[PDB]
């Protein structure tokens, strides 16, 4: 006379955040005040780093569309790098000048896109925000001059108040050079991120 | 520098073979019958070229005889036999088989197939015995006797007395602690479990003498179609599934190539009672090679959501193990799944071309179909096509989603729906006034598992979907309507805020909606979040829990009733009247109860209604 | 004797790659597309290698033809070095399907024949009917061994009542009662109630 | 006449069988050699125990592994005892002749060593992944010797190669063409992380230049006497054994000597995992060790299902295990261990039962698992009953056990009471308890579905029964004055009961009057057998099964009316005045509808109720 319980189907984690960009807008979904810290940023960058490191090992090591609105965060505090987006002339600040010059999305575009998304996620501001101008067409036009004689990068000149991630700032400076040759591999990034996460985890 | 040959001690290998090679006890019978079987088809092949080979006997039978008073077991078969040369080296050598030599000398084409490629089968019989004796007669050699007792020395001799025609008689002495293998139930169970698909009859003797047969069913999938008929399929299904009802769907499958196999798949009529109750280890699909039972208990063989289909798969060659229970390099076992599921799914299409039989099929297997369309992350698109659902403007029947899309109105880019608890609830609910006023269609949702599927089914042939119980529905209007209600917001502005202080929290934003023509108010849920059914279903799961996903709430108000304009006039009169307070809280209570959401404390509502009715009563 | 052809196969995707950072729905399509484009590029490579020697065909030309011949040798070498897919191990041989569409006297027969044969004999619930139960009760009322026959009567009569409650044929509705009995106080109460009914 | 010969064996097919069709994976080959070095190390130590003069040929006893990818070679260098010409031409060159067993048997009567391996057919597993094997050996007497083989059918023995060596044995492996995946750095620690962690000799690993990671740091402690252990060492061993960052909660040391000797360490966790009931991976939280080697894990017939959080290890020796080194034949022996393990787990729980806030945390963590264990097992109810705690009404916030409630009963009543609801506020103010509250009795609460699951199977406690406050048949011991009061009440209200039956009926079996309401007009009660309202609500939603015939025979209700309120008096006086009016119909349907709403069931349609109240308010507002 007992139903004999059993057959728990669990549950999928409820889908919610869909762009990793709309999270950076509303305090209702996630407060923008004192809730802002550094352990969240190092954690999310760490998950992106390990995901990219695993992805780049296999035969599908080339992604081609490194884009934050592609990245998704669920409600288990986990991050996924999906396809989502599913010839494309779709110009954006997020593409590397190596595409705008001739062709052939490759490693260097992935490194450049990683740099710009890291910038956008640390500073918490608009896409490629510059205090000098706020119109999109001249943003694209200046990008068209990125192969000129002076670089034009996201605003991370100076002032720290934090020290700490001085290494990570060295990486983000490394990602912003016209020459695509010297750009580092994933190894230094993931090692430094793992060491910082461990320093923040043993406490 | 010197070169030396390889050595191998014999004595310790003898105990190595009989102690740590197998794990159970019910396999020596299978080994012995397999040996008798290969002898049988050996002499059978020898017959077609020489009839005189069968002068010493025209019948091919295998029999087993127990005897309790001597505690002895006897196996009798008529086959090829041995000569003196065979007995000395073929049997007395560890890890050597005459089958391979015979088939290599027979390198003139393949017409028959036999088993045995290792050469340690015989000594397994020594697991539960002390003395083994073999009596052998050959077509051109005299009667010979062989005896052994696992000591390192074996005995051969010329025996006299009790002449036989030809063949082999094997007599096994038994232990004292293995008496249990001398009864009818155990031998019947073992023989029906392990070796019940051999192309020769097997009998058994119990002592008035008795005559009976342990297996009298023939293999079926070895004959080509265009000869088999429906009645044979029905009889085979009845024999295999030990039931009384017939089958519903049959399919035959055959492949080729380096990996070759044959398959039969069956779909039944009525649903089994203990289907998802599990507990019992799955025993649906069996695997065989050359008609001996190898593996069962499907683990990666077939997906979990198709655990209702019986069938049989036969192979020809496979990398087996020293002990024949497992399969080396299990990855190959995966591949067959890709060749099975697909093909099986094909059947589901062919059944759809006739009307009523598909209703009969759906009525019991809807739940399996829903679990499949949920879990199958790759073939979701194919599975989503063959669903059948209720709808508003039909009768009592169900239609297909494509038929639904075939009648879009003119400027309609979305498909609406609604989930609930029963038909009569969503039939006259408070959300379905304007969508029927303008003239459109709705799809009703009624099962607890159904609400999972819609959670994953977001798109269908270029059109998205929205839920009628979410904030921000968009449907077409015309310019007079738009000017009319935007000037309507310019009237309740003060009203738009007053509820805010009365109900403080547990309300976020209040606006004037356009979905109500016969009800004043309703409660709407946010976009990112759940519905009420989601909350109650989660509260139904008892083995789980966290939290923190509860969606926000919104409240709606209608501009047509006289009640709301009376509230407006009383509110603009003053802000210090308790009449507006109590009627607003009562309206909120009834509105929140009217939309499926659970209550908080029924005592307040009961007391309020009691006071109302008592005051109306006259006291 | 030897097994070496079964050591290198590739799966499109099954379960064995689940690093909790990548989405399975995207990884699956990525792997499948990678395999198909690899197939196509090797395909064009064989066409190029073929066309080389084919258009090649004096001593220099013979040397070129020999060099492309060794190139084809290398191509077969790499082909033998390529792993097995899921799309080269089998072909179809034949298929078919069947829909399986279906196309007082009975009471008297099922009474007399079944009652006589089962009285001689005494699978039951599979074959016996209400008249058989009536004659079993008749045998019990002739009797009043006792406890066991009474127990079987209550057991299969309860099976018939369960079938009536479920409005289904008891011919295939007998395993559920046993799997539920493997309530006891109620069963004993009904047992003693039926015992005092039949004895009275 | 008769003859008696001896058996003979073939060599080529035997070798092919022993290489190609015996094992289920290819990672074993490292494990075999790693194990087969330590035994020789032990022989060195034991032989040196008596002869000090063997201290002048070497003081280091280790094992080193060197890979090389320019030349595609693997080297395993050990400092073992080695062999001479006779053993090299005798022991290694033949099948199934183990020197370990001979050495063990030759010396006895008070020895202490358990060398790994008795079959003698293990070393050839080196041919699983490679193509040529070579062994360099110099034991203690003559020059070095080399042995080269390729599993062809003839091996080669060679004299000194001119390499100056002190002692030990080197095994050099020539890797195949495609197995270079066994050369990069990751898989080395991945493989050695699982099998051969607990071995009593240090292990190093060389990779490059500008010594490295030693893949062993933790000496196992279960081999020691559990009488001078301390908390800190036990804690750091806990931290080493599993990946976490918190200290332990409680531990238990277990040892049985007799027909079967076996020891065990068991831990309870601290934070409950978030996937304790997730599918797949089964019950796996326990590892099986024999002779300091891992065999297998995640076998269901080891621990009862309701225990999926205890973490530890059980180790023993002298067990019958098969060739593949992945299971244990004669499964009968495996069944005996659980009957002791579960008893020791219950003992640990009972000992923990003496602590206050540790038990608070433990209960808050695993209430559901404890209650599932209560429901499932049919043997340990008497013991698992004492570990349950509940809410009450006389203590409030703080918890209580059934023993305290038994200890402070009132001296007249012979029953225990309970009530199952949705949350605390649902039943803290409901209409089902007023008279009990007035008298001064104690009613226990229940607020989780697993409590609902476990309450059915429970039958009594210390000889007292459990009765519901939501079922017909509830009485309190009172004086017969109240009895004749209800008597003349029945004699005074029968026609009202008939009217309440004949109003619309089809929903109520009978209408009765009892003493459980003092401040409410009407209420709903269930029957002596069948499901409750909460039962229907919980079982109507979860899972996939759908057949409500059972509920069709576990669902029936009765209505109760309190004949004290003025409203009942008014409706009754209008009733006996006349019963053909419509106002009586309106009032009775309203009362029944609000009673159904307050009972706990679900209304078949709230729209009609909403329309009724809306009409009432419309008339009240005078529109
Ligand atoms: N009853 C029998 N009749 C004829 N030949 C037999 C019989 N029993 C054994 N043999 C002979 O014994 C040899 C096979 O012995 P063994 O059973 O050890 O090997 P196997 O055939 O590879 O085993 P299995 O088929 O059980 O895997 C063959 O030469 C076969 O002819
Ligand atoms: N490097 C070595 N140094 C010394 N003795 C060795 C060495 N390798 C093997 N032996 C010895 O040679 C014999 C061959 O052992 P083999 O590997 O065949 O089987 P085993 O020792 O029974 O099993 P296992 O390898 O599982 O321990 C044993 O007596 C073993 O102790």
User: Quick check: B542 and D453 in contact, CB under 8 A?
Assistant: yes
- In the reported structure, the alpha carbon of residue D98 is separated from the centroid of ligand 2 by a whole-number distance in angstroms of 7
Look at the block and give the residue holding tokens 């022989």: D43
Give the closest residue to B67 by CA, choosing from B146, B219, B173, B153.
B173
Look at the block and give the residue holding tokens 């179809």: C92
Q: Is C29 on the interface with A (CB under 8 A)?
A: yes
* C-alpha span between D94 and D155 (Å, rounded): 11
Which structural domain, as residue segments, surrounds residue C181?
104-199
Query: Could you tell me how far CA C17 lies from the centroid of its own chain?
Result: 27
Resolution of this entry, Å: 3.9
Q: Do A83 and C29 touch (CB under 8 A)?
A: yes
Residues in chain C: 200
Q: Specify if A123 maps to a domain.
A: yes
Site residues for ligand 1, CB cut-off 6 Å: B 31, 34-36, 39, 77, 79-80, 90-91, 97-99, 115-116, 118-122, 168
* C-alpha span between A31 and B615 (Å, rounded): 49
**Which chains form contacts with chain C, at 3 or more CB pairs under 8 Å?**
A, B, D
**Which residue(s) pair with D520 in the sheet?**
none
**Beta-strand (E) ranges in B306-354?**
310-315
- In the reported structure, the alpha carbon of residue D77 is separated from the centroid of ligand 2 by a whole-number distance in angstroms of 15
Neighbour tally for B177: CB within 10 Å = 7
* C-alpha span between C60 and C56 (Å, rounded): 11
Report helix, strand or coil for D563.
coil
CATH code of the domain containing A165: 1.10.510.10
Query: Encoding tokens for residue B461?
Result: 């042939």
Q: Give residues with Cβ within 8 angstroms of A118, minimum separation 6.
A: A45, A168, A171, A172, A175
Experimental method: cryo-EM
DSSP state string for B565-606: HHHHHHHHH-S--HHHHHHHHHHHHHHHHTTS---S-HHHHH
- In the reported structure, the alpha carbon of residue B35 is separated from the centroid of ligand 1 by a whole-number distance in angstroms of 5
**Beta-strand (E) ranges in B401-504?**
414-415, 418-419, 444-445, 459-460, 463-465
Q: Provide the b/e sequence for D149-173 (b: ≥16 CB within 10 Å).
A: bebeeebebeeeeeeebebbbbbbb
The alpha-helical segments, DSSP class H, found in D480-582 are 480-490, 494-502, 533-539, 549-552, 566-577
Query: Is C64 exposed, middle or buried, given 0-12, 13-18 or 19+ CB atoms closer than 10 A?
Result: middle
Which ligand ends up closest to the CA of B126? 1
Neighbour tally for C150: CB within 10 Å = 18
CATH code of the domain containing C114: 1.20.58.610
* C-alpha span between C69 and C52 (Å, rounded): 10
DSSP state string for B97-133: -HHHHHHHHT-S---------SS-TGGGGGGG-S-EE
Query: Encoding tokens for residue C147?
Result: 């406890």
Q: So what CATH class is B10-204? A: alpha beta
Local structure of residue D90 (DSSP, 8 states):
I
- What is the chain C residue with the closest CA to B97? C1
User: Quick check: C157 and C133 in contact, CB under 8 A?
Assistant: yes
Q: Specify if A134 maps to a domain.
A: yes
Local structure of residue B349 (DSSP, 8 states):
H
Local structure of residue A12 (DSSP, 8 states):
P
At the topology level, CATH places domain D11-205 in: Heat Shock Protein 90 (3.30.565)
Q: What are phi and psi of D85, to 5 degrees?
A: -60, -45
Local structure of residue A169 (DSSP, 8 states):
H
DSSP state string for D269-303: -SSPPTTTT-SSSTT--EEEEETTEEEEE--STTS
* C-alpha span between D476 and D473 (Å, rounded): 10
Q: Do C34 and A60 touch (CB under 8 A)?
A: yes
From the candidates C7, C27, C95, C125, which should be mutated to test the interface with B, based on the most B CB atoms within 10 A? C95
User: Quick check: D154 and B4 in contact, CB under 8 A?
Assistant: yes
* C-alpha span between D76 and D567 (Å, rounded): 97
Position in ligand 2 atom list of the atom nearest CA D116: 27
* C-alpha span between B271 and C173 (Å, rounded): 12
* C-alpha span between B428 and C113 (Å, rounded): 57
Nearest residue (by CA) to ligand 2, atom 15, is D120
User: Quick check: B249 and B266 in contact, CB under 8 A?
Assistant: yes
User: Distance of CA C98 to CAs B248, B351, D619, Å?
Assistant: 9, 10, 68
Report helix, strand or coil for B73.
strand
From the candidates D549, D553, D554, which should be mutated to test the interface with C, based on the most C CB atoms within 10 A? D549
Give the closest residue to D146 by CA, choosing from B2, B471, C197.
B2
Query: Could you tell me how far CA B47 lies from the centroid of its own chain?
Result: 46
- In the reported structure, the alpha carbon of residue B122 is separated from the centroid of ligand 1 by a whole-number distance in angstroms of 7
How many CB pairs below 8 A link C and D? Answer: 11
Neighbour tally for B297: CB within 10 Å = 11
Query: Is B236 exposed, middle or buried, given 0-12, 13-18 or 19+ CB atoms closer than 10 A?
Result: buried
Nearest residue (by CA) to ligand 1, atom 8, is B35
Q: Specify if A13 maps to a domain.
A: no
* C-alpha span between B158 and B135 (Å, rounded): 10
Rg, C-alpha atoms of chain B: 39
Residue in D36, D88, D134 to alter for ligand 2 test, most ligand atoms within 8 A of Cβ:
D36
- In the reported structure, the alpha carbon of residue D138 is separated from the centroid of ligand 2 by a whole-number distance in angstroms of 16
Query: Encoding tokens for residue D204?
Result: 């190093």
**Does D97 carry a binding-site annotation?**
yes
Query: Encoding tokens for residue D164?
Result: 């100056």
Which structural domain, as residue segments, surrounds residue A169?
22-86+88-199
Position in ligand 2 atom list of the atom nearest CA D123: 17
Local structure of residue D446 (DSSP, 8 states):
-
Query: Is B253 exposed, middle or buried, given 0-12, 13-18 or 19+ CB atoms closer than 10 A?
Result: buried
**Which chains form contacts with chain A, at 3 or more CB pairs under 8 Å?**
B, C, D
User: Quick check: C91 and B238 in contact, CB under 8 A?
Assistant: no
Q: Do D456 and A2 touch (CB under 8 A)?
A: yes
Give the closest residue to B59 by CA, choosing from B76, B78, B75, B41.
B78
Within a 13 Å sphere around the CA of B353, how many CA atoms are in the beta-carbon half?
7
Q: Do C166 and D13 touch (CB under 8 A)?
A: no
Nearest residue (by CA) to ligand 2, atom 19, is D120
User: Quick check: B246 and B269 in contact, CB under 8 A?
Assistant: yes
DSSP state string for A172-187: HHHTS-S-SSS---HH
* C-alpha span between D88 and D608 (Å, rounded): 97
User: Quick check: D276 and D366 in contact, CB under 8 A?
Assistant: no
For β-strands B62-67 and B72-77, DSSP reports them as antiparallel
User: Distance of CA B243 to CAs A91, B110, B235, C110, C118, Å?
Assistant: 67, 39, 11, 21, 20
Give the closest residue to B385 by CA, choosing from B348, B330, B343.
B348
Which ligand ends up closest to the CA of D44? 2
User: Quick check: D602 and D537 in contact, CB under 8 A?
Assistant: yes
Q: Give the closest of A3, A201, A202 to D539, CB-based.
A: A3
User: Quick check: B80 and B42 in contact, CB under 8 A?
Assistant: yes
Q: Give the closest of D278, D372, D457 to A10, CB-based.
A: D278
**Which residue(s) pair with D253 in the sheet?**
D265
* C-alpha span between B495 and B571 (Å, rounded): 8
Question: The dihedral of CA B48, B54, B55, B61: what is its sign?
Answer: negative
Q: Do D20 and C2 touch (CB under 8 A)?
A: yes
Nearest residue (by CA) to ligand 2, atom 4, is D82
CA distance D543 to chain A (A): 7
Q: Give residues with Cβ within 8 angstroms of D476, minimum separation 6.
A: D413, D435, D436, D439, D441, D515
Query: Encoding tokens for residue D251?
Result: 């531990």
**Which residue(s) pair with B93 in the sheet?**
D8
Q: Give the closest of B449, B594, B606 to D594, CB-based.
A: B606
Report helix, strand or coil for D449.
helix
Residues from chain B contacting residue D567 (CB–CB below 8 Å): 610, 613-614, 617
Residues from chain B contacting residue C9 (CB–CB below 8 Å): 331-332, 335
Query: Looking at chain C, after which residues does the C atom sit over 2.5 Å from the next written N, breaking the chain?
Result: 57, 103, 122, 144, 182
Query: Could you tell me how far CA D492 lies from the centroid of its own chain?
Result: 62
Q: What are phi and psi of D273, to 5 degrees?
A: -70, 155
Nearest residue (by CA) to ligand 2, atom 31, is D100
Report helix, strand or coil for D256.
strand
DSSP state string for B281-319: PP--EEEEESSSEEE-S-SSSS-GGGTT-EEEEEES---
| Three-state DSSP string of C71-95 | HHHHHHHHHHHCCECCCCCCCEEEE
Site residues for ligand 2, CB cut-off 6 Å: D 32, 35-36, 39-40, 78, 80, 91-92, 98-100, 116-123, 169
Residues from chain B contacting residue D14 (CB–CB below 8 Å): 8, 94-95
* C-alpha span between B195 and B28 (Å, rounded): 11
Query: Encoding tokens for residue D592?
Result: 């029944």
**Beta-strand (E) ranges in C25-152?**
92-98
Which ligand ends up closest to the CA of D138? 2
* C-alpha span between C138 and C132 (Å, rounded): 10
* C-alpha span between A51 and B465 (Å, rounded): 32
Look at the block and give the residue holding tokens 């849920």: B525
């Amino acid at each position: 006379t007992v139903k004999l319980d059993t057959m728990i189907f669990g549950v999928i984690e409820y889908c919610e955040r869909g762009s990793l960009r709309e999270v950076l807008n509303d305090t209702i979904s996630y407060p923008d005040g004192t809730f802002m810290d550094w352990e969240f940023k190092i954690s999310v960058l760490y998950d992106i780093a390990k995901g990219m490191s695993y992805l780049h090992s296999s035969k599908t090591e080339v992604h081609g569309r490194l884009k934050s609105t592609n990245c998704v965060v669920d409600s288990r505090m986990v991050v996924k790098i999906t396809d989502f987006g599913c010839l494309p002339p779709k110009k954006d600040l997020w593409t590397a000048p190596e595409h705008l010059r001739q062709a052939n999305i490759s490693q260097k575009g992935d490194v450049y896109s990683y740099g710009i998304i890291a910038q956008e996620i640390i500073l918490r501001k608009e896409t490629f925000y510059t205090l000098s101008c706020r119109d999109r067409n001249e943003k694209i036009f200046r990008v068209e001059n990125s192969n000129g004689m002076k670089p034009f990068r996201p605003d991370l000149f100076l002032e720290t108040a934090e020290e700490k991630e001085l290494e990570v700032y060295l990486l983000v400076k490394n990602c912003w050079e016209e020459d695509p040759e010297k750009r580092p591999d994933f190894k230094k990034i993931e090692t430094t991120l793992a060491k910082i996460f461990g320093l923040f985890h043993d406490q | 520098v010197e070169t030396f040959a390889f050595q191998a001690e014999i004595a310790q290998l003898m105990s190595l073979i009989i102690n740590t090679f197998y794990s159970n006890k019910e396999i020596f019978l299978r080994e012995l019958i397999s040996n008798a079987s290969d002898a049988l088809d050996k002499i059978r092949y020898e017959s077609l070229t020489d009839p005189s080979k069968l002068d010493s006997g025209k019948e091919l039978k295998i029999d087993i005889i127990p005897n309790p008073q001597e505690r002895t077991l006897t196996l009798v078969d008529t086959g090829i036999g041995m000569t003196k040369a065979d007995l000395i080296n073929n049997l007395g050598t560890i890890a050597k088989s005459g089958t391979k030599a015979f088939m290599e000398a027979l390198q003139a084409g393949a017409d028959i197939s036999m088993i045995g490629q290792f050469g340690v089968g015989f000594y397994s019989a020594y697991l539960v015995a002390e003395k083994v004796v073999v009596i052998t007669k050959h077509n051109d050699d005299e009667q010979y006797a062989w005896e052994s007792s696992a000591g390192g020395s074996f005995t051969v001799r010329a025996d006299h007395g009790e002449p036989i025609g030809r063949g082999t008689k094997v007599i096994l002495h038994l232990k004292e602690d293995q008496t249990e293998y001398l009864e009818e139930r155990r031998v019947k169970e073992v023989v029906k479990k392990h070796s019940q698909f051999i192309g020769y009859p097997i009998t058994l003797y119990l002592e008035y003498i008795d005559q009976e047969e342990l297996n009298k069913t023939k293999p079926i999938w070895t004959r080509n179609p265009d000869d088999i008929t429906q009645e044979e399929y029905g009889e085979f299904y009845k024999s295999l599934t030990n039931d009384w009802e017939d089958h519903l769907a049959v399919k035959h499958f055959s492949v080729e190539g380096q990996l070759e196999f044959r398959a039969l798949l069956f779909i039944p009529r009525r649903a089994p009672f203990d289907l998802f109750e599990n507990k019992k280890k799955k025993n649906n699909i069996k695997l065989y090679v050359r008609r001996v039972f190898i593996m069962d208990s499907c683990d990666e063989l077939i997906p979990e959501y198709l655990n209702f289909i019986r069938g049989v798969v036969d192979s020809e060659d496979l990398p087996l193990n020293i002990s024949r229970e497992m399969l080396q390099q299990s990855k190959i076992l995966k591949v067959i799944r890709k060749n099975i599921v697909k093909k099986c799914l094909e059947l589901f299409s062919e059944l759809a071309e006739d009307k009523e039989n598909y209703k009969k099929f759906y009525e019991a297997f809807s739940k399996n179909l829903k679990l499949g369309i949920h879990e199958d992350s790759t073939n979701r698109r194919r599975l989503s096509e063959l669903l059948r659902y209720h709808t508003s403007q039909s009768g009592d029947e169900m239609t297909s989603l494509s038929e639904y899309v075939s009648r879009m109105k003119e400027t309609q880019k979305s498909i609406y729906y609604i989930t609930g608890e029963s038909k009569e609830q969503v039939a006259n609910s408070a959300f379905v006034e304007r969508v029927r006023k303008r003239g459109f269609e709705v799809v009703y949702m009624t099962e607890p598992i159904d609400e999972y599927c819609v959670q994953q089914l977001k798109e269908f042939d270029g059109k998205s979907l929205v839920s009628v119980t979410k904030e921000g529905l968009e449907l077409p209007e015309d310019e007079e309507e738009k000017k009319k209600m935007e000037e309507s917001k310019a009237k309740f502005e003060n009203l738009c805020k007053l509820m805010k202080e009365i109900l403080d929290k547990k309300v976020e934003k209040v606006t004037i909606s356009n979905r109500l023509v016969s009800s004043p108010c309703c409660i709407v849920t946010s976009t990112y979040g759940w519905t009420a059914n989601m909350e109650r279903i989660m509260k139904a799961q008892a083995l789980r829990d966290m939290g923190y996903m509860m969606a926000k709430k919104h409240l709606e108000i209608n501009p047509d009733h006289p009640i709301v304009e009376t509230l407006r006039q009383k509110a603009e009169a003053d802000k210090n009247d308790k009449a507006v307070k109590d009627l607003v809280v009562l309206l909120f209570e009834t509105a929140l109860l009217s939309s499926g959401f659970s209550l908080e404390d029924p005592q307040t509502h009961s007391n309020r209604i009691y006071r109302m009715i008592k005051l109306g009563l006259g006291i | 004797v030897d097994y070496s052809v079964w050591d290198h196969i590739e799966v499109s995707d099954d379960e064995d790659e689940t690093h909790p950072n990548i989405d399975t729905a995207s990884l699956f399509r990525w792997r499948h597309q990678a395999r198909v484009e690899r197939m196509e590029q090797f395909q064009k490579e064989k066409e190029e290698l073929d066309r080389g020697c084919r258009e090649c065909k004096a001593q220099q030309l013979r040397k070129e033809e020999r060099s492309w011949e060794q190139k084809l040798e290398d191509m077969r070498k790499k082909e033998k070095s390529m792993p097995w897919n899921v799309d080269t191990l089998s072909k179809d041989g034949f298929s078919k399907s069947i829909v399986n569409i279906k196309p007082e006297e009975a009471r008297e027969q099922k009474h007399k024949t079944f009652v006589e044969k089962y009285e001689k004999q005494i699978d039951n619930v599979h074959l016996v009917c209400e008249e058989t139960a009536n004659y079993l009760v008749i045998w019990c009322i002739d009797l009043e061994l006792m406890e066991q026959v009474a127990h079987q009567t209550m057991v299969m009569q309860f099976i018939l009542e369960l079938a009536k409650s479920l409005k289904v044929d008891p011919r295939a509705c007998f395993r559920q009662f046993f799997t539920k009995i493997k309530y006891m106080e109620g069963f004993k109460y009904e047992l003693e109630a039926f015992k005092e009914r039949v004895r009275g």
